[PDB]
Amino acid sequence: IVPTRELENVFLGRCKDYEITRYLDILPRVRSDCSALWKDFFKAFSFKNPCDLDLGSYKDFFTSAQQQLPKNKVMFWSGVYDEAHDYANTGRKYITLEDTLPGYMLNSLVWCGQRANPGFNEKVCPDFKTCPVQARESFWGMASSSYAHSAEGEVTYMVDGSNPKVPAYRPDSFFGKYELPNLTNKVTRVKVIVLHRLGEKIIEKCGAGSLLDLEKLVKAKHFAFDCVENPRAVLFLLCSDNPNARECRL
């Protein structure tokens, strides 16, 4: 995979832009300056092998880049990137990880280290599977954990429930591994929104399959649990894209 060109710059520019202009109302600014944020990020993967990472490689970056999150606005999504980010609305309805400083700066970027100077590879990064999961999940799983760990109030998990190959709730999913295990008792309630993609076949129901295994685990973890499938606001959102869908007549 050819990595992001001018990572230093893209990173520093997404950081300045965010700093001076992004979720001014919504999120808090971080206290570290962009360059400090760069040393910590860079010191995490540089001069090592590309697959030479584990969950704790970016600890220092996340400690520096972590913002206190707005009460009851936190949202986790799974299998519904657009629907979930379209619904959260830029921090308006909710905040997703990609609205937080770290999610914003590194979202979609490809980077990897190497031992030789410059300290990182700007020509080629190894593919997926090549690396072990924790080297593969070193950055984003750590971002979720840090993010899940900062949630307070009701927490929302929007999920795909019209997929016959991937159940709404899975243990070995970022949610089952990084986000739910990291929810602190500042968290009061896990609200799940099941997404039934218009047109298609309904696979997951609340109070039924893995949404039932999740229901019990959540309460076992002492949080309250609410589940809804295609609530109206998400349905209209979904209809906007497919007006002429039967679910959308009126």
Added chain:
Amino acid sequence: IVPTRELENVFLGRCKDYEITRYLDILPRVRSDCSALWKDFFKAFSFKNPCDLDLGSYKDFFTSAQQQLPKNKVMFWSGVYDEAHDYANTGRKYITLEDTLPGYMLNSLVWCGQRANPGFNEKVCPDFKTCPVQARESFWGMASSSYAHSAEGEVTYMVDGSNPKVPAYRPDSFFGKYELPNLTNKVTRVKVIVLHRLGEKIIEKCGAGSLLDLEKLVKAKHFAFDCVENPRAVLFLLCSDNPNAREC
């Protein structure tokens, strides 16, 4: 106004991230370097009094910032910012000016030149102390015209039609003064979408008033014309934020 802090870095940074990571499948990359774009931009205003600008001050910047726009996707809006952009969907359904290189970069940024070094004022800019309107409209007036001018195929103009105090179509606005006028012969149909806010009064309507003048005007221009009020899709996007609504 208090002007943007660290303009050069916000500009250069919004530029680099756009060039390298934004709209990769929606809009082409401009050939000019971001340092060249800054030079052309800075040149337009630095070391002049903030009111010393006219619609040709940024010619160069816009000439360099200009992207070929996808056919039939160009949308112009008025009074319905959030709705139009939500509707457009960051360039997927329609592309707005805020999605192009120049609107993406200077969007929401405030800045002003001054004669004294270093040429621009980071401490304060005029608001109530108003300059002629062409100074006042130097950047965005030119951004709107260069953009209207690169449009091809269908062009959509989303307007608000539930505001007594201000009408849908007025030649006194950007679409009248900058947009519609520069629409080229590559354009073909001007599709109007009137946005009647949920739970408010239909002030404006298609076929009547402003919408009707604007109609003759397009027809004069020799463009096909079209007008819709709260199309389904728009109405659903409205409902999303007001599921509970007579209309929903």
